[PDB]
Design a protein around this ligand. Structure first.
Ligand SMILES: Nc1ncnc2c1ncn2[C@@H]1O[C@H](COP(=O)(O)OP(=O)(O)OP(O)(O)=S)[C@@H](O)[C@H]1O
Ligand SMILES: Nc1ncnc2c1ncn2[C@@H]1O[C@H](COP(=O)(O)OP(=O)(O)OP(O)(O)=S)[C@@H](O)[C@H]1O
Ligand SMILES: Nc1ncnc2c1ncn2[C@@H]1O[C@H](COP(=O)(O)OP(=O)(O)OP(O)(O)=S)[C@@H](O)[C@H]1O
Ligand SMILES: Nc1ncnc2c1ncn2[C@@H]1O[C@H](COP(=O)(O)OP(=O)(O)O)[C@@H](O)[C@H]1O
Ligand SMILES: [Mg+2]
Ligand SMILES: [Mg+2]
Ligand SMILES: [Mg+2]
Lengths: 486, 338, 327, 255, 319
DNA sequence: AGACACTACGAGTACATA
DNA sequence: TTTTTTTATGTACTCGTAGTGTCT
């Protein structure tokens, strides 16, 4: 092996913790967490401490790629005497063999730490393992991939567990919410990377000035690996870099990453984009690509927060209400288009049209400043709640079908306003001696206690029984529960 | 109660004498009977009349029915669970209990019942309006291929979403809502049998005037207000209105009072709270528009635009799936109109 | 026997000299094959123009009568996925012929229904194996093909069949069959074809069946119009005149009697009136805008059903209100 | 009316298993001299030609030439429905449709009647290839199948080289390379283990691994297989049965 | 006929980085890289037919010399490139021992990298990270957005642009000089006009015109290759009067056999990529084009629908 | 005669779709 | 600042009982 055969990112890789750039707080927190790991296992993780690290036996590092998560993890692993072990998605990771291996390795000692050196007074921890998992977000979605298996692994283990992923808040990563201590590595500061670039430039005889690293890391968006690769790629031809050719370099190395459904909502509802000047800079093709970055949450977010802005593109003689009405009309048209898309015939070739009608046109109608905060779309939770209520109403209707002889909606609209007066009202106006009447009325339609509980949740407006059931004396409720349980 | 006093035969019907005579004529010869489609307002009594007609085609055991369960497998491993109302002479299916999987249940179940078979077994399709166009197309040929073993009696409230082939493949029977006088006479027999105390009979008439021909709603409201007056209705007993109707009325008051985006947010919130509690959006739009037209503050120019926008957004909702996306648009258009 | 196949299948061209209408592409392909440089072909065109017949006759001329063995013909009826490509197409391209010596031919007929992954895998098969095999892609819509795959083949656009070639084929059929055709009947037949030989052959067989005679008589315009159910220009112009000039009730009665005397359809009358009014030199384009918009709306509504009388009255009122702006 | 009766019912099973994987549909031509079949692979890389004379049929009656187009994934299922000590009977009416198989036990009394719906295959299969080859070798079928299955694990292309009394099978892949070299010898103690080779000019050409693995599946028919190679000609892999033969015309890969 | 000749795209395919008339900056960059060595991981993105695959092939050839056969691993979209392949074969090639000069490295060329699955792309990260001192990765794709950001973070990004008129004209002149073809200025101009920055398509059209007529003239080029589809659609949409647009749609598009789906899709794409008119009118035209496409997809695709679409577009442009 | 490595075809589970 | 939205075929993975050639 020679020197010119490795990339600049490998020959300038950090050899110790004192050369990492930025995120000093995170690396110190993880170092303290790994240091007190045996102090945490000797008392079974009950004492968390002042740092709050010690109750969780696993640590999950999450942040953008290329900021030094894996590097810092490996560095602290070699520095604290822990015998390092790495396994990731590049190797086979399933529910069958990965689970078996990790289970056999959670409370087994290392032979490498035993045979290498075990006689000097270095540490009693060399016999231990540190299972460092990389690309945790790269596993398969289902349980067969091993994400839930690893989540359960982070609950029962005698060796420190280190998890490293690039994307944290994902559905697949939901089980890791309350099981492992979360550490977030953030965008590094400009000074440390500036000094590192100064050093790596003076070492390679690369002419470079301090005025350009700011724009460089701005267009790179906090990625030291990409910056190093950029310098290694362009330093071979252009020996001296300055403020003359930096424009072409920034335009050719623009990081094209898809935005989250929250930044997409900010860019869509930005009034400067739709101005006469901003139109010829962020063209309509870019606006459609914005929606195509995430075409599942963009229309919902747009419909949620299109009427929560202050418009700055109002035509002369048009109020905010008119623009909101036109935006809602286009939202309805885009909804019709989406229904035509995600139905039979699979008219997916209409996806670009759904880009304009659902997101682009309503946002353009009410583009401007953001008044409050970008609120997440509540249509998902409302749909889930409506589905649960529909399932409950279906159970109630199929229980009462033997007597009602009506439909689901016909039972919800008209029958429930009378079932409320029949079941619950005798409890408020008669006391605890009206239990038998309610029991007979419920058995007349084969109702259950769970059905009685679910019935009182359908009413709204001036009839909210959530406090009426609490106003009922607890004696009557206990007597009813005991009577129905006999 | 609605269920305690319900006719069980054709001779027990107490309104629409011409319809009862037509049903008797149609049940005189039961074997040469084509498929039937009962259409009319919701709450008229068509589901009782279909069972009464079955009671004339078969023995009295048609009402002794049982609820069973049947499982289906779609193109994926998602298991479709559907309960079936069955009788030793007929069976009832309600394809309105699932999503876009109506075609599978329809075709498979009807083919199983037709291959196993007075001489035929009647089939009652409840709420045929929720039947998707693909399920109706699948039933189109099943109605004709097996006509000697399976006869369909489809109960619906409006033939608008029913396709033309299905309309042609079955006789159409209209059930007009009973007059206020017949509703009053029925409520009289009910209150004399349930031992209610009426200071003046005219209140019963008012019940009819509050039900808009609906007997199911009329009897339920009468019983609900009989529990508030403690089994003794007075001359000025208040009318018991459902909660969602009061919410819609308050929504219209908010609409005519304030027309702005800040009020549009709370309007969207009210729409979400209404939709989350098992309330269809078409009925919400219908009631909202009808009670907005009742606002005396508006003029003919406003009401015409309101009804036009309601028709447009009703078409939108019938062509869409995200109902609030059309409801909020209609509300915003009404706000812009006023 | 060939006497049992329909006229569309019986008269399928077997040689490149029987493919009429396409002359600029046929001569170029013949030159490509004679001189040897045959590139990857992309036959794009409407249905019934003769792309499949052209490529079949080409493969016949190239390999002889054993065409069915030396050519790999895949279509939408066969499973065409990415794995199907990877195995079958690559094994065909990499290997050689089992019957003779020469380049191979892969005819991907109706390749507009292939998956995007299949085309992405095939675009490197066409570029890698290009010294021992060739590719022919037949398409009706050029938007279903990826631009990478679209750029690797030489595109030939099959124009609709013109009057001369379709009349030549009609004369060939009238020679092959004991049948006579009137000149005006032939013109009306060419009018209702839009360059589709399939329709012409089908309706010719149907009107020969309609003759009811031992074919000692001729086929006139009446036979064609009664067999295809198409409206006549006479009734078309009469309805248009009664709509434009006569009274509302009289126009309604005329439309009703015309559409009920011959059992004509409202959509055919709509298309005919659209074709006739296209030659009308009109005033300010607002009338044309209203006419086109309302007629397209009525056509889209007819395409889903409804009341024929209501739609006919709508057509009458739309045409009338559109022409009321021309004054 | 075609009426054939086999001596052993398992011979037809072993014959059809040879085409089961490498051929999908077949078109049996039955004449007064025997049954012929020619089929082309889906990828059209190999051609299967089976010929079985009337010597194999214990009884044979062919009034007129009959064409039976059928599928092999169903014929194999029908054949597996038989028995090891049974006899097979093929019946076809005057018009070819719904061929009938009859399995009859010779030890007990048993009749198994199966039907198979014919299919109308428009493509005719009557081509015969009779041309001199550059080299003709003969080796035990097991010894050839072993080398094929052993070299198929290294790569997807196997190169055959015929030189002056030398037969070389080379396979170069990503995990390494390999080459088996054999010499034609004459074995007097056992004739079925000898290796014969008559060459006119050296040959060097490659095949694919999948088709070569599918070809050696017919090794259960005969104890010795012949290989005829020529300069850019379909290689002839022949298994000779006591009443005819099965020959695979394999097409090499262009270099 | 017995055999064919190699096409001019494959015969005259560049084998040295100097013969590439593509983007000069990236070409000189790759030339200096092959001269000095130490080739890093790279991702070349762009449009079809601009010299991406040829560029990486030339780079690998010049960098490996005679060791190209045993040091370069080519994987196209025609081969299986799933998680199993990346796990077994790519890792075995990266771990393979090979004695190379002290300035070269093993190259893994992955054509059509935008088609690899997410699992394979995720597994390739550590695969290219642990063996980055003896194995280098070169991806060639058309959409850099289809490749995950972790993979893009470990490599250089080379975005190839369209080829200007001068470069394609120079390459065609070189090919004509090497082939002794009779041509004319207007014929080459029409060829370049119908190419639209596509060098492969330009050479293919040139070879087809040569083999079909012999003389490369604008008349021959236009009679064998129709005018570009989007330009006629743009001229139809940008018409000022309704009758002109209707006549254009009738004669150029409908009378030549262009399907209604292709017409409406081209109209949508042109209106999306249009810059002559404002944003709001463009959005309204896109709305009308989509309303028309919703009827075209339902099987109501005729000339009347396109005429009504043009009429509505003109009414929108009618203030 | 038999045991068990090798193996290939079948049900399950998700993941995109311009 | 935070998690689901139908059906429809193509694509990719895995476990998986199963069918058969091989070894103490
Ligand atoms: N803070 C840093 N200071 C100096 N070099 C760094 C830093 N972060 C990353 N690097 C360089 O980037 C290389 C790769 O670092 P990694 O830790 O592997 O990246 P990462 O943050 O783990 O993101 P991944 O690998 O895509 S999950 C190192 O070998 C260094 O050369
Ligand atoms: N140019 C032509 N000359 C003569 N007959 C033709 C011609 N074009 C079509 N036909 C007739 O129409 C039949 C069908 O032709 P095809 O080639 O199958 O149509 P097509 O051009 O392939 O369009 P498709 O198959 O719908 S994509 C042929 O068998 C002929 O009978
Ligand atoms: N810059 C160039 N100079 C000369 N010939 C070129 C150039 N670019 C492309 N060509 C020609 O085009 C052919 C194919 O080029 P490719 O590199 O395969 O196209 P591409 O840029 O990779 O786009 P793809 O493969 O469709 S994603 C080559 O064999 C050359 O004949
Ligand atoms: N002829 C009748 N006389 C008295 N009550 C009737 C009559 N017809 C229907 N009803 C009442 O209608 C109720 C059922 O209504 P239903 O038929 O389910 O409404 P829908 O017609 O909307 O299905 C029963 O409780 C019954 O008391
Ligand atoms: Mg990492
Ligand atoms: Mg065709
Ligand atoms: Mg390429």
């Amino acid at each position: 092996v020679r020197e010119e055969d490795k990339l600049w990112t490998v020959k300038y890789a950090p050899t110790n913790l004192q050369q990492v750039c930025g995120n000093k707080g995170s690396v110190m927190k993880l170092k303290n967490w790994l240091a007190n790991w045996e102090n945490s296992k000797k008392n079974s993780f009950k004492h968390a401490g002042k740092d709050g690290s010690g109750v969780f036996r696993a640590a999950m590092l999450y942040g953008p790629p290329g900021i030094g998560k894996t590097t810092a993890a490996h560095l602290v692993a070699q520095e604290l005497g822990y015998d390092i072990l790495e396994q990731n998605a590049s190797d086979v990771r399933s529910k069958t063999l990965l689970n078996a291996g990790v289970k056999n390795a959670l409370d087994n000692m290392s032979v490498v730490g035993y045979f290498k050196h075990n006689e000097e007074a270095q540490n009693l921890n060399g016999k231990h393992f540190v299972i460092i998992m990389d690309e945790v977000d790269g596993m398969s979605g289902g349980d067969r991939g091993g994400v839930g298996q690893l989540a359960q692994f982070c609950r029962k283990t005698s060796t420190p567990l280190i998890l490293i992923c690039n994307e944290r808040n994902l559905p697949k990563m939901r089980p890791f919410d309350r099981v492992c201590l979360d550490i977030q590595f953030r965008r590094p500061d400009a000074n440390s990377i500036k000094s590192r670039l100064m050093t790596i430039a003076i070492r390679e005889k690369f002419k470079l000035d301090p005025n350009v690293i700011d724009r460089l890391i701005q267009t790179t968006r906090g990625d030291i690996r990409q910056v190093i690769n950029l310098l290694s790629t362009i330093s071979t031809t252009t020996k001296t870099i300055n403020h003359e050719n930096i424009n072409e370099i920034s335009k050719a190395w623009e990081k094209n990453i898809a935005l989250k459904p929250f930044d997409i909502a900010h860019k869509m509802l930005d009034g400067q984009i739709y101005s006469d000047i901003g139109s010829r800079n962020f063209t309509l093709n870019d606006k459609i690509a914005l929606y195509f970055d995430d075409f599942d949450f963009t229309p919902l977010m747009i419909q949620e927060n299109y009427l929560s802005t202050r418009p700055s593109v109002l035509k002369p003689g048009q109020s905010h209400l008119e623009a909101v009405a036109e935006a809602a009309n286009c939202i309805s048209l885009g909804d019709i288009v989406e229904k035509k898309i995600r139905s039979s015939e699979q008219l997916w070739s209409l996806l670009p049209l759904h880009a304009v009608l659902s997101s682009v046109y309503p946002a353009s109608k009410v583009a401007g400043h953001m008044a409050g905060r970008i609120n997440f779309t509540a249509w998902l939770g409302q749909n889930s709640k409506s589905a649960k209520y529909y399932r409950l109403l279906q159970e109630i209707h199929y229980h009462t079908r033997l007597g009602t002889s009506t439909d689901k909606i016909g039972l919800r609209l008209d029958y429930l306003p009378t079932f409320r007066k029949r079941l619950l009202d005798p409890f408020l106006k008669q006391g605890a001696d009206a239990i038998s009447s309610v029991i007979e009325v419920m058995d007349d339609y084969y109702l259950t206690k769970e059905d009685w509980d679910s019935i009182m949740e359908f009413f709204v407006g001036p009839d909210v029984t959530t406090a009426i059931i609490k106003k009922i004396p607890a004696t009557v409720k206990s007597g009813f529960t005991r009577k129905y349980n006999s | 109660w609605v269920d305690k006093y319900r006719p069980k035969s054709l001779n027990a019907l107490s309104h629409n004498e011409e319809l009862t005579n037509f049903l008797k004529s149609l049940s005189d010869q039961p074997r040469d009977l084509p498929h039937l489609l009962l259409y009319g307002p919701n709450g008229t009594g068509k589901k009782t009349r279909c069972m009464a007609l079955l009671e004339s085609i078969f023995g009295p055991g048609v009402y002794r029915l049982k609820i069973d369960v049947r499982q289906f497998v779609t193109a994926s491993n998602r298991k479709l669970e559907l309960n079936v109302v069955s009788s030793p002479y007929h069976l009832e299916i309600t394809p309105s209990d699932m999503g876009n999987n109506d075609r599978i249940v329809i075709q498979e179940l009807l083919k199983e019942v037709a291959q196993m078979e007075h001489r035929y077994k009647c089939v009652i399709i409840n709420e045929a309006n929720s039947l998707t166009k693909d399920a109706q197309a699948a039933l189109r040929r099943t109605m004709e291929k097996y006509s000697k073993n399976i006869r369909l009696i489809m109960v619906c409230d409006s033939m608008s979403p029913i396709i033309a082939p299905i309309k042609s493949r079955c006789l159409l029977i209209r059930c007009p809502a009973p007059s206020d006088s017949e509703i009053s006479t029925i409520l009289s027999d009910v209150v004399t049998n349930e031992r209610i105390q009426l200071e003046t009979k005219d209140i019963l008439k008012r019940i009819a005037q509050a039900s808009n021909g609906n007997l199911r709603v009329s009897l339920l409201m009468l019983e609900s207000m009989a529990l508030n007056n403690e089994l003794a209705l007075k001359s000025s007993s208040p009318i018991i209105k459902p909660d969602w109707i009061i919410v819609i009325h308050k929504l219209t008051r908010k609409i005519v009072k304030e027309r702005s985006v800040n009020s549009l947010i709370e309007c969207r919130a009210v729409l979400y709270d209404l939709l989350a509690h098992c309330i269809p959006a078409n009925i919400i739009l219908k009631e909202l528009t009808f009670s907005l037209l009742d606002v005396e503050t508006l003029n003919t120019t406003n009401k015409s635009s309101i009804i036009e926008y309601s028709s447009v957004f009703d078409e939108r909702l019938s062509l869409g799936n995200k109902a609030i996306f059309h409801l909020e648009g209609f509300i915003a258009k009404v706000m812009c109109c006023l | 026997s060939k006497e049992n196949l329909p006229w569309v299948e019986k008269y399928r061209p077997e040689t490149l000299d029987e493919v009429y209408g396409q002359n600029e592409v046929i001569t170029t392909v013949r030159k490509f094959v004679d001189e040897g440089k045959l590139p990857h072909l992309l036959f794009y065109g409407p249905p019934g123009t003769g792309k499949t017949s052209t490529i079949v006759a080409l493969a016949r001329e190239i390999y002889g009568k054993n065409y069915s063995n030396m050519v790999l013909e895949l279509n939408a009826s066969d499973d065409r996925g990415i794995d199907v490509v990877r195995n079958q197409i690559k094994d065909f391209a990499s290997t050689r012929q089992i019957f003779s010596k020469g380049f191979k031919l892969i005819i991907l007929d109706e390749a507009d229904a292939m998956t995007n992954a299949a085309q992405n895998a095939l675009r490197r098969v066409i570029e890698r194996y290009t010294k021992n095999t060739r590719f022919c892609v037949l398409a009706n819509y050029a938007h279903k093909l990826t631009p990478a795959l679209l750029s690797r083949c030489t595109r030939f656009r099959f124009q609709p069949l013109p009057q001369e070639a379709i009349e030549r084929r009609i004369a060939n059929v009238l020679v092959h069959e004991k049948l006579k055709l009137s000149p005006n009947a032939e013109k009306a037949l060419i009018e209702l074809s839009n360059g589709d030989m399939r329709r012409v052959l089908n309706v010719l067989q149907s009107c020969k069946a309609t003759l009811d005679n031992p074919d000692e008589d001729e086929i006139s315009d009446d036979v064609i119009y009664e067999c295809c159910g198409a409206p006549r220009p006479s009734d078309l112009k009469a309805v248009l005149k009664s709509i434009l000039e006569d009274d509302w009730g009289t126009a309604h009665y005329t439309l009703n009697k015309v559409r009920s005397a011959k059992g004509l359809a409202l959509i055919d009358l709509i298309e005919g009136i659209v074709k006739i009014l296209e030659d009308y030199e009109l005033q300010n384009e607002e009338t044309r805008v209203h006419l086109l918009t309302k007629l397209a709306d009525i056509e889209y509504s007819i395409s889903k059903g409804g009341n024929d009388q209501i739609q006919g009255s709508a057509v009458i009122g739309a045409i009338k209100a559109s022409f009321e702006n021309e004054t | 009316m075609l009426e054939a009766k086999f001596e052993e019912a398992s011979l037809f099973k072993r014959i059809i298993d040879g085409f089961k994987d490498c051929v999908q549909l077949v078109n049996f031509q039955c004449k007064e001299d025997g049954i012929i079949a020619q089929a082309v692979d889906d990828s059209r890389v190999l051609l299967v030609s089976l010929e079985i004379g009337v010597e194999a049929f214990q009884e044979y009656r062919c009034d007129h030439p009959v064409t039976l187009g059928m599928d092999l994934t169903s014929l194999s299922k029908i054949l597996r429905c038989g028995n090891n000590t049974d006899t097979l009977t093929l019946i076809a009416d005057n018009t070819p449709d719904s061929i009938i198989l009859l399995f009859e036990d010779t030890k007990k009394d048993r009749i198994a009647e199966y039907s198979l719906k014919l299919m109308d295959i428009d493509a005719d299969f009557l081509k015969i290839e009779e041309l001199q080859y550059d080299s003709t070798l003969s080796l035990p079928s097991s010894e050839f199948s072993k080398i094929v299955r052993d070299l198929s694990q290294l790569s997807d292309s196997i190169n055959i080289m015929i030189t002056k009394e030398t037969i070389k099978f080379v396979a170069d892949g990503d995990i390494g390379s390999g080459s088996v070299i054999i010499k034609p010898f004459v074995d007097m103690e056992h004739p079925e283990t000898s290796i014969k080779l008559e060459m006119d000019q050296p040959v060097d050409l490659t095949f694919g691994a999948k088709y070569l693995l599918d070809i050696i599946k017919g090794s259960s028919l005969s104890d010795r297989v012949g290989i005829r190679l020529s300069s850019e000609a379909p290689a002839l892999f022949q298994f000779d049965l006591k009443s005819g033969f099965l020959q695979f015309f394999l097409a090499p890969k262009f270099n | 006929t017995l055999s064919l000749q190699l096409p001019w795209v494959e015969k005259y395919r560049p084998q040295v980085l100097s013969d590439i008339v593509g983007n000069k900056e990236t070409i000189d960059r790759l030339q200096q890289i092959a001269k000095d060595g130490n080739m890093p991981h790279m991702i070349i993105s762009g449009m079809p037919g601009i010299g991406k695959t040829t560029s990486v092939h030339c780079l690998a050839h010049e960098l490996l010399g005679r060791s190209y056969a045993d040091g370069v691993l080519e994987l196209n979209a025609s081969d299986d490139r799933g998680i199993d392949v990346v796990r077994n074969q790519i890792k075995h090639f990266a771990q393979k021992k090979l004695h190379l000069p002290p300035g070269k490295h093993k190259i893994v060329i992955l054509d059509e990298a935008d088609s690899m699955t997410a699992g394979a792309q995720q597994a390739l990260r550590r695969t290219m990270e642990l063996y980055s001192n003896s194995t280098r990765f070169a991806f060639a794709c058309n959409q850099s957005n289809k490749i995950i950001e972790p993979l893009q973070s470990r490599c250089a990004i080379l975005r190839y642009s369209k080829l200007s008129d001068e470069d394609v004209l120079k390459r065609l002149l070189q090919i004509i000089k090497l082939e002794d073809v009779k041509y004319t200025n207007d014929g080459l101009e029409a060829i370049i006009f119908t190419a639209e920055g596509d060098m492969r398509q330009a050479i293919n059209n040139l070879q087809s015109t040569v083999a079909g007529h012999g003389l490369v003239n604008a008349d021959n080029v236009f009679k064998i290759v129709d005018s570009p589809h989007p330009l006629i659609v743009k001229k139809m949409l940008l018409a000022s009067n309704l009758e002109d647009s209707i006549q254009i749609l009738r004669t150029d598009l409908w009378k030549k056999g262009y399907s209604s789906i292709d017409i409406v899709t081209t109209s949508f794409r042109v209106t999306k990529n249009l810059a002559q008119v404002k944003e709001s009118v463009r959005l309204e035209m896109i709305k009308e084009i989509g309303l028309t496409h919703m009827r075209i997809l339902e099987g109501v695709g005729t000339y009347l629908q396109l005429a009504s679409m043009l009429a509505k577009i003109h009414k929108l442009n009618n203030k």
